[PDB]
Design a protein around this nucleic acid. Sequence first.
RNA 1: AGAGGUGAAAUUCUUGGAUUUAUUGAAGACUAACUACUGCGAAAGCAUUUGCCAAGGACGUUUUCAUUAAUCAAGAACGUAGGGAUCGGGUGGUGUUUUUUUA
Lengths: 709, 10, 171, 232, 232, 118, 55
Amino acid sequence: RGFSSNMSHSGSLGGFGTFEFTILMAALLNGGGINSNKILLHGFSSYQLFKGVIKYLATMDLCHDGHLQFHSNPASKYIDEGFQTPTLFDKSTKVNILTKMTVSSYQILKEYAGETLRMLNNVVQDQFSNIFLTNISRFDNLKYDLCYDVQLPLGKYNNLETSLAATFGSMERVKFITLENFLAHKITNVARYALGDRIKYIQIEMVGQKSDFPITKRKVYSNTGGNHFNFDFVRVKLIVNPSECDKLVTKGPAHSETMSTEAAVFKNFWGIKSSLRRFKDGSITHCCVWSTSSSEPIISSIVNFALQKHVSKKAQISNETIKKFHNFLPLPNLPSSAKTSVLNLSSFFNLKKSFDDLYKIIFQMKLPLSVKSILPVGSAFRYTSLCQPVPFAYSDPDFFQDVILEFETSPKWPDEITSLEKAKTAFLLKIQEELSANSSTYRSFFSRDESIPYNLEIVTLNILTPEGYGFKFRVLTERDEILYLRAIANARNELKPELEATFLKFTAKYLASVRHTRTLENISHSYQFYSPVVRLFKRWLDTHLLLGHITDELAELIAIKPFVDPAPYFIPGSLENGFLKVLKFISQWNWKDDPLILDLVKPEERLTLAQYKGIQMNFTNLRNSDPNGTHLQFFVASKNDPSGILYSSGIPLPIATRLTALAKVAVNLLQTHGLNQQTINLLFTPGLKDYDFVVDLRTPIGLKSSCGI
Amino acid sequence: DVIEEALSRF
Amino acid sequence: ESRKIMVPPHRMTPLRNSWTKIYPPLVEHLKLQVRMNLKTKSVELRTNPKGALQKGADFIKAFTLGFDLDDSIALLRLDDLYIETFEVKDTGDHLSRAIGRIAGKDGKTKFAIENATRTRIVLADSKIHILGGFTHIRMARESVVSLILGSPPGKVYGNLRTVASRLKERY
Amino acid sequence: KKGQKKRVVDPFTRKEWFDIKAPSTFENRNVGKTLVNKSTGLKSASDALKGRVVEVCLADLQGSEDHSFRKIKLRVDEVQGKNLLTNFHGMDFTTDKLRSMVRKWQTLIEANVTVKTSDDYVLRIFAIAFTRKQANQVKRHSYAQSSHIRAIRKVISEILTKEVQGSTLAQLTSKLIPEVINKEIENATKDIFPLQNIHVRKVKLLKQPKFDVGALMALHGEGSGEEKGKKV
Amino acid sequence: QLLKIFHLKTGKVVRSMKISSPSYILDADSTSTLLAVGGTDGSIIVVDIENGYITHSFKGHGGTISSLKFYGQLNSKIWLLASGDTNGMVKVWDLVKRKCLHTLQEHTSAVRGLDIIEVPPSLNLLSGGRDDIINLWDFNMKKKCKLLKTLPVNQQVESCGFLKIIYTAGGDAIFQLIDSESGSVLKRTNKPIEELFIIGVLPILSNSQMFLVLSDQTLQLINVEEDLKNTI
Amino acid sequence: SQVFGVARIYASFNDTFVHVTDLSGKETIARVTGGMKVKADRDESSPYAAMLAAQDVAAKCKEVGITAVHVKIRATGGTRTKTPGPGGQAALRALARSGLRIGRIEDVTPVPSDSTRK
Amino acid sequence: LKEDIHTHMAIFEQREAQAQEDVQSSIVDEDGFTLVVGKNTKSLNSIRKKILNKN
RNA sequence: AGAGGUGAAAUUCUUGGAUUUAUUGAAGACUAACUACUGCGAAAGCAUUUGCCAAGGACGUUUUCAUUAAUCAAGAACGUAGGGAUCGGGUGGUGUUUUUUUA
């Protein structure tokens, strides 16, 4: 976790360490409770000692309310207040052993206690390598969510007074060791007050720091890029509550007539920008407008002002990765779309409104056999499509979303499979006939579909909605499932697995696809960065040329895997942290001894021990029948598909090995060269490789104004 | 009524 | 703005009798472009391309309540009155002799009510419709509910004397 | 009477009007208005109302008198600038419809399944199906054999616990608005008995997952607070 | 039904009218002969008082109508009307052209206590409300703008400014005199220990003295002309 | 474009409650009974007393601004007479005729479903 | 495709009704053996395959 | 500012807000409408769903045994013919509801 016992007062993640761990274990030996109830006995070994330790650290605060007391010369209890710093009192010394690290470092360590406690107390699966044997401290943006680098060219210790706007006082040099110390404590307090309910946790870490200075020299005598203090530039690492990133108004206290001290310090901290406003509720409250841009998250703008207003007036901020991929996101032709966020879903809601008026006008009419239910299954209906869907945007091949519709269980149906799918075409003929009869402002046509093999006579009904959208309609019946099963049963015995593959494609296209889009569309409103991480993953995967084999639901499942199981990390509060968590995981991931079980559940209906063991057992016999992954490479199993072979089927071994190799090359580049603009451009290079074949294709028109990006 | 003859039997 | 007014088939034929003497006192004077939907038994009064809609509406509303044309022109003139309906509810014993105590004989007690408190009342077999001044409607309804609650006709005649003096003498 | 009665409280100048907005499963999402209190200190009347039920009629939600019955219940659980964006809380027939349906010389089948949906909403959803006199039937009764009762109740409980456990609350409300699972019950149990009008008559909630204001906003539509021209 | 009483010995009803909706607002002009009635519907009728007749209809308004104001001194020329609603809007009306001038949609609660004045035409108006905006607008003949709102802590019920220039704020058993182009209440009365509050300010002898009515049915005299020069 | 309360008329015997509450049913507006419009302890459930009780309820309801009513009539129900009394239809009819739109008439008498008598 | 699936349904229902009528008209064997048949079954191939699946 | 309760009264409670209204929670009792000249049980009695435990009736039967039956002391456990319907089972008919290779 990166917690060595050096110091976090000097601006580095650490301070807590191994003998502090010893001291709290032996302090919890003789009690721990408020009545000194024995937290730790040596009746249980290191595993339950460790579990009780993490339980006590996660359920017993030290910073702000309560901390441990003990005296070595002798019970140990839990006193009630907190000293606004990590604290535990040892009265036989009168010392505060946890005052080597700071408030945010203790805060993030209590979070790590809670998180590893959550993934340790469960009796479901085993994750010992997930909890120990992966050094999460290797990368910055992997254990953190986003990063800023403050470059402060202060010049000299005397040039301070016109190069930086911070304090310079006896009262700060008496409590802070040096320049990096007072700027560190000032910058963590102004980041805390600037964001507050805008981020999960802040960690400050001055890089270029070193505890190294030679024999001949009196000090660190080092030109640290515009100063001579032991740090080069300031890592400002943020992990964010992702539900309030792009909320464009933060709120101070309201307006009394007597302008009290909280509104006072709010107006001092925010200067000319923030003011008191009316709202639709009618409250008169202190706030400030944050002009949201697409490429820029407003978290960078608020930290830019909280840097360039208080600690310096000419220092500058380095964060270019977010804007570097945010134009790799495709920007749709929408009104003020540059000022729209990436966490805005107004395009998907616009087609959902168009779909709902279509839904009403297809329910309010008369068939010879009424509608049981229609259910959209589209990638836009699960927030995944690469165009953020603008009306009239034909050039995207998934412009036409697909909606399954099923009538009621009439036992009048034709028998053989071509006849029943032709009867479904007959129903679609009737529905578009009445559609053009009554509401001719919608238009329509028919298109053959061959995404299922060997059924030659299956068409879909495509409609063009005058709000400007296009929907496929595929009729499902209660009969096609048992028709495919009895076709399986009476087929010739050397022709079984191909018809089984046909039925698997049918199940993936019609049946399990509905609960698929239902579950992850329901969970995307709890994991808010899901649609941007899948959209950037899919554009990465098409630049590296895999979508012609892999399916989009499989790419969607590989991208939900770091969200519904993010342990040991956080859920990703930013797009970069999501994307490199994806690629780090799939570079880690094997196939031969590695399935992929995920439960698409809400945080804090799940997958229990029995279903887990059944999934692992059919995986086990599946790939002892399959020796090394000759034709079955991945295994993605959810609650909605305990088979796991539904989306992984069909992809060739060169494509799957190319994906895993590209992931390992990407994590190699990440740990070697670091993040940069040319790093991200090399991460989106085609990797064309000149493997035997290159064609260059250009249709006689350009199609981005027509696709709407 | 070609489409009605196609949608008989139901 | 427009207004529909439903009409029942027990004032329909006298409305056809007096149909020639309502819209010539209406359309040249209180314009209100008029149709009469016999298809659903309503009367349509829509606005003028060249607040009289309320006055025409309660004009024919007093007519379908069943008051005289003199009273309906007395509603066009004197724009301060009020129409009012209430049904008894307070089967034979509590219907027949109760409305008998209302009417007295030949409408003479109803006539005493009317001439005492300056209103105009009409009544079907069960309902009561009273129009005129507001305090007069209050007082007349009080006397009627007294004599259907049960009071001697001489005692409500004394109450009628007091209320007639009060509402035909000033202050 | 004998006490002292605190003469004047004038309790409408301090009272405030909100209005409620249904989710987009319906179409006439505006429903009505609601009094609360002055939104002031020590009470927080903006959040003192955020669990109230409302009981509308589905005819007044859908603009079609064909389902005049079936008064449903919405639940305010948030505030967004005087607009209470509500969500589903239940469903119930009027008493008029069930009393008009129940009549003798026929028998009725009850069913009710408690079931968690694909979300964490556990419901119990009810069902009434009456026994139909067959066309050409000359006898008086048309009762059920009382062992066809059990098979009917078994398959009606089975197919409505297949409609739930699957089909999340948006899909559940959108599938019990246009009376389609009644027709499902009819088309799957016209084998055993003819079964004149089948209905669901009641959906009760029992537990809810959490607030989830993202999904609660996605049920209605997008809109956020912004600035106002102060000029001071 | 409205009644006018000739205030002499013959206090007979000179004219009664029957109005559309029950009414809680009448405004008279600075002289006599001009009276404006506002119902619980948005219908603002203007009536002559010499011989009683409706003289201006003014039907096209939004909600139930809260307080409204005339304009015009003795032998003026404009003869305007304020007409502020409950939902927030104020539609200013003139009778000399039988017409509207502007429409204002800046409040949220019931617009109460509004008044117009000019200084050389300017014709700026104040318009308070049950919220805590005070809301002056520039209000030219053809164009439109808005000045500061000064944002009290109060519940403004029927407060009219435009003194010699200080502005009144009443309705929480508190009389504030907010200042021009600033927010500084300098005249703030002693709020009583009970909560019953001011319903009505009343100018006496052309804004010289002042009556405050109270919700326990009392009335107080203020002497704002002396207290403007005087110091609570 | 009207605005709706609900009526919640309780047509018990020996009394008659009418209080139009808000649409949720939580903030009640203008409760009157049938016992505070006449004072004799006998006629306090009369149709006339109930209808004039309804008249001044409609007065204060139009004062607040509610212009239309979903009406819910309630008998004494439960283990008792289960029929609406004399004043229910009277108060409903008076609220109808006194300038107040009425929609969705409904009977919310509490059916026992095998309560206790044994 | 209107007339195409019109002709397809018009031959399918013809051969279907022919098959079902041939099923439950009368089946005596070469000797006297009346074949047991369902109330609403449709094909000799259907009863053949279900008597195969009940092996 | 009244509300249970009354034939009125009386009495009861109510400004420490009752009755009524809305949202929940607990408790045990009970299975309304469906319910009939219908069902079951030796009788008294017996109506929510599901599961389990056994029992019983009638019907079906080219199954078996061969008078094993009948009636109460004593004692034992429980508190005249005919006709129209209708319930439970069976057989046959051949039209509609039904359906079709999952049972």
